[PDB]
């Protein structure tokens, strides 16, 4: 179990680990996040009491180095920091751990919620999605466009989701315009599955955390590709057996998690109608369907 | 965007655009079978490639056999629609390749958007206009070439005939979709209208009669009588 100590907390703000959160009081003696699973990325989160406007946040690995957080008053924000002396972060985080000034990761025993959410996700993924080589760890905020978003303005703070567009010519071959139109296999396996993810385990890691960003900043770019990459499995008739299986619990567990009041905001009814209804796929998601009918039933 | 009574005097600009209309492509008669079922039998059909400006149709005959072994014929039909344009554009030297393609009904956005991915200059409309392109079948020498092909066949006309050297395209694409209008709403008045004094005739390089000036006018009107006189039957007005 590893620990994220911060420095401070200078303003008051809403602090985000994974799917919790607090609220810390202006100069309240909070000192850190303890007790975080080793296993899992992790994303620690931040939105201020008096600026609500930009929720923002740092994707992390403990296992790749010792991270701390600590506000900047210039720059504003609570920034994530490696610390490469390992005997003054040990030091630190036991005289904190010590005076009890730390929130511990609360995770139920039973609950897998978690890992169900990150399976696929893996930190280096994440850094090339999000690209800031000098740094081990990931900023994602509520305002950054995507790679795509950006072709219909700075490249530097980009999500390089993988472009996905139904009406190009990456995505139909010459000569099968109908047959690659109507049915998406040849888009999903040959050019995304083998091409360019070269496995549905990165593609299920790329989906998954553009769900992840969508859901804690808000981030609009990536709920686009969260259902782009849904759509494009739906509407293929030919998808291996262990995928369907798979997105089903993906999925189940999302729409588990999104909070209800989100829904109307996070969830594209035609996607989703098309995805559970018309689509190739339609009968080979009774998790999903079962649970989006059960809490969702308005949006269809 | 779309195409509409505000942006309508954009079809007689210079730019070279192409209305599409694919309604008479996917043609059949509905009969019972033996056994007291419904089947459908095709028809010859054609697409109606039509420049506003100019008059030239591309009359692209579609020959039945092109639905044999075939599902889902009505979509089917729209991409075929698609597949044939896309050619048509590939065919043209490039200064004669369409700026804009108008089509008649939404259906074909998607398909026709997906063949010309190649022209991504080459901007596909729809239009809020409610064009009486149907009705090109019920031009006497345009069904008699679609019925009488026995294999695909492109067959190019000028459907203004030579009014061009007397008027406008304008005027020329207005007095089409009114003979158009007439005889979609009915047939029967609108062919007597047009044939009722035998000596007016239609040339043999033409599709509507040799009308003088004058006699134009005196048909527009007849045209417009038809269509208020349907309107009032219709509704019992
Ligand atoms: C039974 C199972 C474990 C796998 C198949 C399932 N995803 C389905 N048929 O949608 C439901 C859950």
């Keep these: 179990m590893n620990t994220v100590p911060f420095t401070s907390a200078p303003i008051e703000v809403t602090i985000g680990i994974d799917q919790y959160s607090f609220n810390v009081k202006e100069n309240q003696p909070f000192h850190g996040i303890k007790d975080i699973p080793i296993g899992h990325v992790h994303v620690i989160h931040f ?19 010792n991270f701390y957080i600590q506000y900047d008053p210039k720059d504003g924000l609570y920034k994530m920091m490696e610390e490469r002396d390992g005997a003054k972060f040990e030091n630190i985080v036991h005289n ?14 039973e609950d897998d919620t978690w890992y169900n959410l990150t399976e696929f996700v893996q930190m280096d993924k994440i850094r090339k999605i999000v690209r800031k080589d000098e740094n081990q760890f990931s900023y994602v905020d509520s305002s950054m466009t995507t790679v795509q978003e950006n072709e219909l303005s700075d490249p530097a703070h980009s999500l390089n989701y993988t472009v996905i567009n139904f009406k190009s010519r990456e995505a139909i071959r010459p000569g099968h315009e109908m047959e690659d139109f109507l049915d998406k296999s040849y888009y999903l396996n040959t050019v995304m599955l083998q091409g360019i993810f070269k496995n549905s385990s990165n593609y299920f890691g790329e989906l998954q955390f553009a769900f992840l960003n969508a859901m804690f900043f ?34 189940y567990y999302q729409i588990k998690t999104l909070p209800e009041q989100y829904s109307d905001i996070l969830l594209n009814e035609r996607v989703w109608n098309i995805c559970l209804y018309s689509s190739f796929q339609k009968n080979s998601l009774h998790n999903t369907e079962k649970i989006m009918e059960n809490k969702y039933p308005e949006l269809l | 965007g779309a195409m509409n009574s505000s942006n309508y005097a954009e079809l007689f600009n210079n730019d070279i655009k192409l209305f599409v209309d694919d309604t008479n492509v996917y043609r059949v008669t509905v009969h019972k079978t033996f056994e007291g079922n419904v089947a459908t039998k095709a028809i010859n059909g054609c697409i109606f490639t ?66 010309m991915l190649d022209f991504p200059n080459i901007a596909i409309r729809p239009t ?62 609108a062919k007597m209208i047009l044939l009722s004094d035998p000596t007016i005739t239609i040339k043999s390089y033409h599709l509507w009669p040799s009308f003088t000036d004058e006699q134009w006018i005196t048909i527009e009107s007849q045209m417009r009588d038809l269509i208020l006189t349907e309107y009032g039957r219709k509704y019992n007005v």
């Excluded at chain 1, 904190?96 to 025993?109: A, H, L, N, T």
């Excluded at chain 1, 981030?219 to 259902?227: A, K, P, T």
């Excluded at chain 2, 075929?80 to 896309?86: G, N, R, Y």
């Design chain 2, 50 to 115: 039509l420049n506003p400006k100019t008059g030239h149709l591309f009359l692209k005959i579609i020959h039945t056999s092109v639905w044999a072994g075939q599902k889902r014929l009505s979509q089917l039909a729209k991409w075929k629609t698609a597949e044939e344009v896309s050619a048509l554009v590939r065919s043209l030297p490039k200064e004669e390749q369409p700026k804009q393609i108008i089509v008649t009904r939404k259906a074909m956005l998607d398909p026709l958007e997906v063949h």
């Design chain 2, 128 to 189: 809020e206009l409610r064009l009486p392109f149907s009705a090109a079948m019920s031009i006497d020498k345009l069904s008699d070439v679609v019925m009488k092909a026995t294999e695909p066949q492109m067959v190019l006309f000028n459907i203004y005939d030579d009014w061009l050297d007397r008027i406008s395209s304008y005027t020329a694409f207005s007095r089409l979709t009114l003979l158009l209008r007439a005889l979609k709403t009915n047939e029967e008045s």
């Design chain 1, 218 to 251: 808000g981030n609009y770019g990536s709920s686009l590709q969260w259902h782009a990459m849904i759509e494009l499995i739906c509407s293929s008739a030919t998808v291996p057996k262990h995928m369907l299986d798979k997105l089903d619990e993906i999925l």
């Design chain 1, 96 to 109: 904190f751990k010590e005076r009890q000034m730390m929130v511990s990761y609360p995770k139920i025993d």
């Design chain 1, 47 to 65: 939105q201020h009491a008096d600026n609500s406007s930009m929720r923002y946040g740092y994707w992390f690995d403990c296992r790749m180095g």
